[PDB]
Every structure is written in structure tokens, then in C-alpha cells.
Amino acid sequence: SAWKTVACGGTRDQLFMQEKARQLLGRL
Amino acid sequence: METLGGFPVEFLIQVTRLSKILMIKKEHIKKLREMNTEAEKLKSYSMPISIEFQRRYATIVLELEQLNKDLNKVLHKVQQYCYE
Amino acid sequence: RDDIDMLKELGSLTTANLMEKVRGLQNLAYQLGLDESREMTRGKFLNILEKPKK
């Protein structure tokens, strides 16, 4: 159930980093 | 039911995709980990991060995001398929 | 391509060996997921992805 959080890159800092990456590259 | 070698072919397809996603994601994680240690070194010496470094790093993050979306579903179908 | 070749490689396995592979691939997903999340925590607190302001 939460084993997928790890397996599919869903942790809180990864979602954060994805947000920063979108902003740095200018992508929605 | 379509088969290949005695197995349902749609199962083998999902396992093919699973293996391929993981191999790419492994490469991406290796690149991220080294980029972190470089940045860790730069930051320790108060040295600036190049714009090109940031861009490459951000590209790997967004690529991982997509691989993980594909990994999800594929992992689900593989799990779904393991009737055994 | 190397993808159809992998598909053929899998279909040529015994049932026991295909199942070990699936299990290995599932374990690999989890291990990589731990690695990935750790480097995402590292990168966040190194501020690699802050925009230039000066």
C-alpha cells in the first residue's frame, strides 16, 4: 500500500523536487 | 488467449516493460547521486552551481517522474497478473 | 529491438525462472525506490534546484 510510495517515487521530497524542476525549466 | 512460450503474452509484455523501466531508472538514480555529491562538494566550498548542472539535474528529475508514472500501472498489471 | 528480444528471452524461461525474475524485478523496484528517495532528500537540502537570484 505504501510500498508503492517508495517503489514509484512518491515520497514528499521527491514530489517537492519535481515541483522545483518544473519551475526551473519553465514547465507546467 | 495469446501466448508465447506457454505464458500469456500480455504478462511477458508487462514484465518486459518492468525490466526496461527499472534499467533506465537505475541509470538516472546513479547520475543523480553523483550530481548530489558534486553539489555537496561545491556547496561545502561556497562554490556556485552551474546553470548547465541545474538544467541536467532538473531534466533527470522530470524524467524520473515519467518513468515512475509508467512504473506504476506496469507494476500494477504485473501484480494483477501474478495469479501465479 | 532489444525489447522484443527481452520479450522472447522471458517467454523461453521455465515458469519457476520467470517467477524468480518477476520477484527480483519487484525487489529491484523497491530497492531503487529507496535509493531514489534518499537522493531526492539530499538534493532538496543542497538547494540544487533553486533559481538564480543574483
In chain B, the number of structural domains is: 1
Q: CA of A27: which chain B residue's CA is closest?
A: B62
Distance CA B80, CA B35 (A): 36
Single-letter amino acid, residue C8: K
Q: How many CA atoms lie within 13 A of B5 on its CB side?
A: 17
Q: Show Cβ contacts of residue C37 under 8 Å, excluding neighbours closer than 6 positions.
A: A6, A9, A11, A13, A14
Q: Which cell numbers hold the place of B56?
A: 541536467
Each as own residue / partner, the long-range contacts of residues C28-34 (CB below 8 Å, 24 or more positions apart, any chain) are: C28/B22, C28/B26, C29/A7, C29/A8, C29/B18, C29/B22, C29/B71, C29/B75, C30/A3, C30/A6, C30/A7, C32/A7, C32/B22, C32/B25, C32/B26, C32/B29, C33/A5, C33/A6, C33/A7, C33/A8, C33/A9, C34/A6
DSSP type of residue A1? -
d(CA B8, CA B81): 9
Interface of B with C in 14-53 (CB under 8 A): 15-16, 18-20, 22, 25-26, 29, 32-33, 35-36, 39-40, 43, 49, 51, 53
Confirm or reject contact between A12 and chain B (CB < 8 A): no
Beta bridge partners of B3: B8
- Distance CA(B37)–CA(A23), nearest Å, equals 23
Whether the Cβ atoms of residue B55 and residue A25 lie closer than 8 Å to each other: yes
Q: Sketch the domain layout of chain C as residue ranges.
A: 1-54
Question: Within an 8 Å CB–CB cutoff, is residue B55 touching chain A?
Answer: yes
E strands of C1-54, at which residues?
none
Q: Is B57's CB within 8 Å of C48's CB?
A: yes
Query: Subunits touching B (CB < 8 Å, at least 3 pairs)?
Result: A, C
* Cα-Cα-Cα-Cα dihedral sign, residues B14, B17, B21, B22: positive
Residue A11 · residue C37 · CB < 8 Å: yes
Residue-number span of the structural domain to which B2 is assigned: 1-84
Residue A10 CA to residue C37 CA, distance in Å, equals 8
Chain A residue numbers touching C43 (CB-CB < 8 A): 17
Contact B62 A20 (CB under 8 A): no
User: Which residues touch A22 (CB under 8 Å, ≥6 apart)?
Assistant: A28, B62
The cell for C54 is 543574483
C-beta atoms surrounding A6 within 10 Å = 19
In this structure, the strands spanning B3-4 and B7-8 are antiparallel
Query: One-letter amino acid identity for B56?
Result: R
Selection from B15, B33, B3 nearest residue C29 by Cα = B15
| Grid cell for residue C19 | 517467477
A22/B1 Cα distance (integer angstroms): 43
Contact C7 B4 (CB under 8 A): yes
Residue C33 and residue B38 in contact, taking contact as beta carbons nearer than 8 Å: no
Interface size between A and B, measured as CB pairs under 8 A: 37
Instruction: Give the gyration radius of chain B's Cα atoms.
Output: 19
